[PDB]
């Protein structure tokens, strides 16, 4: 459940749904933190694909170099560590969306393999000459400008111009000012009904304290102040005195 405030973040929503209802690949920017996921499940949502699966892999953070494995999936022996046959994400979003967050971390050649799936909507797991039809709605994410990136020759300029169609620039918190407020409280509220306690109010003098902070770490970062505000609080009222930021 996506929630928003301010006119800025209300306008791309209202473009949101506009591609939700096609099947074009969407391309989500913006800065680390700012939720740039949690509207591809809105897309997602808002497709006619909701009832579909939604697969998610994060290019950043999948260890021992494993992104391109799970990925297109690999049959048994397709490289030194493949005991077991296994299949790919894009196998597993058969029929729903795929979300391929932080896409700017493929290498070159990934790209290439990512660029050919995109083209002949078909997979083939590593190893494997045998090649799956794919009925799969792309979504992605990248924190970088991919455009100046692809002038920097580390990311292909025919992939990037495929996933260019329809781009939406998630913006910082500081640029979306009237998101804070109600996303705070969205945050205390998850919390309270993760562990069955009573929602706590929060003081004028708190909410004004986290409207004038500019949100480096954006979300990510209002989440961590809300939680540390609820320990502080013992989940009681929060005060102006349990918001610590970094000044
Ligand atoms: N508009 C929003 N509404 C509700 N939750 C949000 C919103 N924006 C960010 N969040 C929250 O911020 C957190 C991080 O979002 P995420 O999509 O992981 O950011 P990124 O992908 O840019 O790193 C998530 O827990 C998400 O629930």
């Known amino acids: 459940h996506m929630v ?35 509207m591809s499940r809105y897309i997602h949502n808002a497709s006619p694909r909701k009832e579909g699966p939604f697969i998610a892999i994060n290019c950043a953070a999948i260890p021992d170099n494993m992104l391109e494995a799970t990925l297109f999936g690999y049959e048994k022996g397709a490289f030194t560590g493949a005991v077991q046959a296994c299949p790919g994400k894009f196998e597993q979003a058969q029929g729903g969306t795929i979300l391929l967050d932080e896409i700017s971390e493929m290498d070159l050649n990934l790209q290439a393999k990512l660029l050919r799936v995109l083209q002949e909507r078909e997979v083939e797991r590593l190893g494997s000459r045998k090649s799956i039809k794919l009925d799969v709605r792309v979504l992605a994410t990248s924190n970088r400008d991919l455009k100046q990136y692809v002038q920097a020759g580390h990311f292909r300029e025919d992939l990037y111009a495929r996933l260019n169609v329809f781009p939406l620039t998630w913006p910082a918190l500081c640029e979306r000012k009237d998101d804070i407020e109600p996303l705070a409280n969205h945050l205390i509220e998850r919390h309270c009904k993760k562990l069955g306690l009573p929602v706590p109010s929060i003081a004028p003098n ?6 004038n902070y500019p949100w480096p770490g954006n979300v990510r970062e209002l989440d961590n ?7 502080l609080s013992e989940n009681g009222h929060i005060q102006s005195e349990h918001i610590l930021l970094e000044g």
Do not use: F, H, Y
């Open 225 to 231: 102040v809300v939680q540390r505000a609820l320990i």
């Open 4 to 38: 928003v405030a301010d006119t800025k973040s209300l306008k791309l929503l209202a473009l949101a749904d506009k591609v939700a209802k096609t099947d074009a690949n969407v391309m989500i920017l913006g800065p680390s933190g700012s939720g740039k996921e949690v």
């Open 206 to 211: 708190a909410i004004t304290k986290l409207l």
